[PDB]
Amino acid sequence: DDGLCYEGTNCGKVGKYCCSPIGKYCVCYDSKAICNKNCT
C-alpha cells in the first residue's frame, strides 16, 4: 500500500497531482498529499 507521486495532468488531475508506480493506478487528488496518502 505505497508508491510515489508526480505533478501535472496525466491522470486528469489538472491543478492537483497524480500517483501511479507504472501509470496503472493513475489516481489523482487535490491534496498532493492525498496523492501519496489517499493514493496508497
Main sheet attributes: strand count, strand direction, barrel closure: 3 strands, antiparallel
Classified by CATH, the class is: Alpha Beta
CATH superfamily: Amb V Allergen
The helix/strand order is: EEEH
Overall number of strands? 3
Structural class: alpha+beta
Q: Per the principal axes of the C-alpha atoms, what is the gross shape?
A: globular
Read across the widest sheet, the strand sequence of neighbours is 1-2-3
Integer count of domains = 1
Instruction: Report the CATH topology name.
Output: Double Stranded RNA Binding Domain
Bin the strand percentage: 15-25%
CATH architecture: 2-Layer Sandwich
Number of helices: 1
Determine the N-to-C terminus distance: 5 Å
Radius of gyration: 8 Å
Q: Please bin the fraction of helical residues.
A: 10-25%
Organism: Ambrosia trifida (Giant ragweed)
Protein name: Pollen allergen Amb t 5
Subunit structure: Monomer.
Disulfide bonds: 5-35, 11-26, 18-28, 19-39
Structural features, described:
20% of the residues lie in helices and 20% in strands. The protein has 40 residues and is an alpha+beta fold. It has a single domain (1-40), classed as Double Stranded RNA Binding Domain, CATH 3.30.160.80. Strands 1-2-3 form a three-stranded antiparallel beta sheet, with helices on one face. The longest helix is centred in the last third of the chain and has 8 residues, at 32-39. The protein starts with 5 loop residues before the first strand and ends with a helix.
